[model samples]
Target chain A: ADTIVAVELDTYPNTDIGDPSYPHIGIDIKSVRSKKTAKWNMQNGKVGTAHIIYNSVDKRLSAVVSYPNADSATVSYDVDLDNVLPEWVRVGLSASTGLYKETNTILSWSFTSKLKSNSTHETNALHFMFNQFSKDQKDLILQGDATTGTDGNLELTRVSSNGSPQGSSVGRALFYAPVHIWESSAVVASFEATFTFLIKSPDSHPADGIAFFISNIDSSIPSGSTGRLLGLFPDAN
Target chain B: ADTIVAVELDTYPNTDIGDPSYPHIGIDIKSVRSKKTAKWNMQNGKVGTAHIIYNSVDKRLSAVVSYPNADSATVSYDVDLDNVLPEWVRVGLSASTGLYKETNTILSWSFTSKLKSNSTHETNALHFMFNQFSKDQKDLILQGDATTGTDGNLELTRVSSNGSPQGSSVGRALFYAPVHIWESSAVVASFEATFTFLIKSPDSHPADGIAFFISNIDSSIPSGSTGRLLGLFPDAN
Candidate 1:
């Protein structure tokens, strides 16, 4: 229900989430059910503006609501946001008047995005850090049974493996410097990684869980990492 | 200079590209120097609110600007966002007013990101499968070093993961971010992309290679974007 692709200006018509009793203008996708609608009467001191357009070569999604007395209403839908959204999305505007006491006023707002560009725009410094875990953790790489404890934490499996010498355990703390994973055609920069981990047990119960992975800097630490393999392993690596 | 990390609330100090003689609250990295500052006299009708925080595990970037007669100001900086910035960033809020005639009001705005996750179905036919991927699995947006599974392999380097020099990598499956390929001003016809890959290094001896590019809609990855520049680079146009 949160995969919403909406454009509702519905002025209260809760037909049990089916809406459409009075003022209308809908196009919702992941269901608030209005796959297509337009019956505008939305008036209250008069002032409205809506122009939701999405047309990836006809994967269409359109909406238009205008009022200054000239009155206008339009709605269109086809759907193809890679099939309902997920390439990093979030664009503003939301309103609620669920009852009778309602006051939704957004006088002005603007947004514009037009992707496709690389006319020689490149820059980088590529930095790396492995904060804490010092005392001989040469910037990172603490594989299998992962250590550093004497209290510096980062103790992946100090005592949980039962048969592979340490019992189905796998550990890694990698960084040994390999950051900035994109090149060839250019355009990859902008990265952020902040870590702090904790999982301790002297026998209070905790079997296997912990994953913050991004691998390929010469891989290892998986000769089979127990159970649902949090340290990943399937195609026999 | 394109790796910009800005935080300016400067009215006008115009210190010849190094502002800070009066209305200061700057922190723009990559240029215009003001790596750190705290002293803003922004007042008009006394309506202010600024809360900027970026604590990538203490690579802190803090700022506080508030007023209701209880003036407030704080500043913190420890930059090193992957060496000053770039993972595709362009967050907004800008201002200008020369000879004192200003109006910069961003009454309300928000942006929060946690990134890396997936699906609602519609990648239609750009199918992808890469050995063992699911530790939260939003599913697709695999960049660099790549990884996946339960569906057998999409790996870019693995043999201690080789391509020599412990290999170079870039893996992306941006289902939509820029898959539109021109909608507004022409160019939107012939298209067919059905791909799946595997180059499992049986033992060793696998010299760097892999290319499936469509760069620059910002899935990003170019900074010494290594070997085979098939990931792409050279058009320094």
Candidate 2:
């Protein structure tokens, strides 16, 4: 009855995060270890940490993260949202949390769907203009260091973060225009976004998960090994 | 009446401003061509821009500006007062506005202060931290040209500036931690501070006038000039 669509996957490759078909709006990839370290697949020689998997005909934007060896994840894209308007766009994740247990996988999400026009052609301007602060009190609580074979390597340290120039961040962070989506002009329709990720048991067979936002006014939602990246989440933090 | 001292002056080195002292807190030395500059007569010709200058002996913190015979201005230092809770302190011009009828002289002041330990070490730590930030923005604003001469100049572009770090501006302006004249521990008292600076014209006898602020909120202070360092009043921005 309404103008909406959904997506599902049986065996999508984690390597195809930038494919032009899925039109991913957001993505979070996990699990990809080496003989020495267990880190995100994105660190496995990917030139850029983030990219927009766009579908030209659909005029959609998919946010995707690629973790080599890890199962591929997907979420729908939204195009008609504008600043000032609160749009409700439902994003889905087709993959499960590779390894997590007991730790409540609380999902925290924020929106900047109000896409502002790009003035400066700089990369990672999103972080420069907006305040993207992440708290890492608890992350991979139960996930062990698949790397170095460390027993309790359950902390989630930041792999990478960056932004553009001409940005200000003394007290209030102001995200730049090019690297983010903000309202270009005034609009009537509301704009909102929803993100779905995973929180699973590491030793379990396949499923053991839950997700929700805890009490926080943070714009940057953090996620990592269970314990170090969680905040206030009962089992997570 | 109980135990307090005070001092007030608009422009220094002028007829109106009180008498001049050896360790003068404010002085207005001007000449106009392309820039204005100031230097500190350190131990041995170590002429440099002191970030935070406070004479523990006199219990005074000076805000001096170095300008060339040009057109510009900038904030030189922020005499930290948290440790040396002097009985009285004030910032005024070394000269008068009527001295320079050709150009304009506007001095602005602003700051932000938080309640913290009054210990010299802790206060030094806090002042150093904020001083680092102030120097950071100053470096960015002046493009590393923080030495002597007209290499970097400041000009009063417009009025009604956000001034603090809020509205895309830079600079930790002239601020004074309120006098916490403590008599005994557990026994508290209430007191506040108002910072002021002078603006003189580039006339033969310290001419010119400007505006400034004593704020602790917005740090969007502006700094840009090739020769002379300029400033304006808080409300002026």
Candidate 3:
């Protein structure tokens, strides 16, 4: 399941593709099992990028092609179940240049996917407070100082001595696990959520606040997502 | 199965989140199920926004953290399976400011998903030969007049008036449907596609060309993707 499928094509002098009169090429996703297909192309011999997404659970097909950092073209359509037979998946491309009057081009492509790691939940309940997480679980992802106290509570922030600056020092913790959010495909995957936590400072000198976030960059933290910008945006400000 | 999981966060001094001694916080999605959270504290303190999306089919998660017209950050990663469990999904957030301070600043959030409209094929086969589509079908998306008559085929580019400019107008058509492209995840989903069409002009006076595109922005045609730009890019030239 963990693989990446990709393709890249560029225009160079000698490669020429074909006749300049019809200088165009594209990719076609054909399903032998269902005899169905979805295609994306580049017309008029122009340079562009094409991305295709196929969700097997719902058999939804979407594609987008665009000029480098410019305008774009997109499509979303459906396909039959039989179209994705594991053994029947195929990939191909086509290109032609009219009259042999164009620059040499190159097309590079690759296919990638994530491994399907399905397993029973470590806990029966779906939700867990920071305190409920094990030290090992907290270790899964590196964060500031997200630790579970013996009282079964999570501590994300730390306080300092009176001499320390008010808005100084921030703590964090990250949990690790294979979190699957789509029962089938992204098109049909919907969700709702809320979380609770507290913040405090020594005496009544509370200088700053805290924030919670959800990101795809698993395993570690972004160096400066802390301070005024809340570590979410860069420290450029 | 088309759904989008998203999150947002904000902070400003007066809104202060609550306290200043410790201003800033946010969430990060690093892997499937396990979330590695991050927190930020701004020395000067300012408001910020962050959003996250996890596409189950592609197992791709992405997020954007930013200040209004200012600095920002983003990241994307793959998640293992079982993270996208169907019928079982939730979203939430956590926050805190230490011992002495802060406001009950409410973190506003919302969740939404696209409905699955899988009744019957709006058409017979998955493929539509322009002429084969019903008027209702043609009405679903914008394109050139694209009529079906004597030729019994679709015409995207019409012949022009004798004195008219060659390739002066652009023609396009978009199909409508909850076209599912993924079954379970996008990582394992790979596809290829192509379209067979002809390019011609009146009296052999064809100046520009035509192009085929697939994009996420459904229904309308891109404004400046024609002429020397092929109607795929803006009219900068």
Q: Can you write out model 2's per-residue Cα lDDT over A115-159, one digit (the tens) per residue?
A: 222322111111110011122211111222111111111111111
DockQ of each: 0.02, 0.04, 0.01
Please say which candidate is ahead in DockQ: 1 or 2: 2
* Candidate 2 residue-wise lDDT, B1-237, digit = tens: 011111212222332223332112222221111111232221111111212233332434334433333332222333233333332222211111221222221222222222222322122001101111111122122211121111112322211333211111122222211212222211222222222222223333322222222222222323331111223221211
Better of 1 and 2 by TM-score: 2
Residue A222 Cα positional deviation in candidate 1, in Å, after optimal superposition: 50
Cα lDDT over the full model 2: 0.22
* Residue-by-residue lDDT tens digits, candidate 1, A162-187: 31113345455554433332222223
For model 3, chain A alone compared with the true chain A gives a TM-score of 0.36
Considering DockQ, where higher is better, how would the candidates rank from best to worst? 2, 1, 3
Query: On a 0 to 1 DockQ scale, where is model 3?
Result: 0.01
| lDDT by residue (tens digit), candidate 1, B45-146 | 345666566533356666676666776777778864545543333232222221223222222223332211122211111111212223222324554544
Best-first order by TM-score = 2, 3, 1
Tell me the whole-model lDDT of each prediction, alpha carbons only. Answer: 0.41, 0.22, 0.30
Instruction: Compute the DockQ of candidate 2.
Output: 0.04
**lDDT digits (tens) for residues A142-206 of candidate 3:** 34533444234344433223322233333444334433333321222211111222222223323
| Top-DockQ candidate index | 2
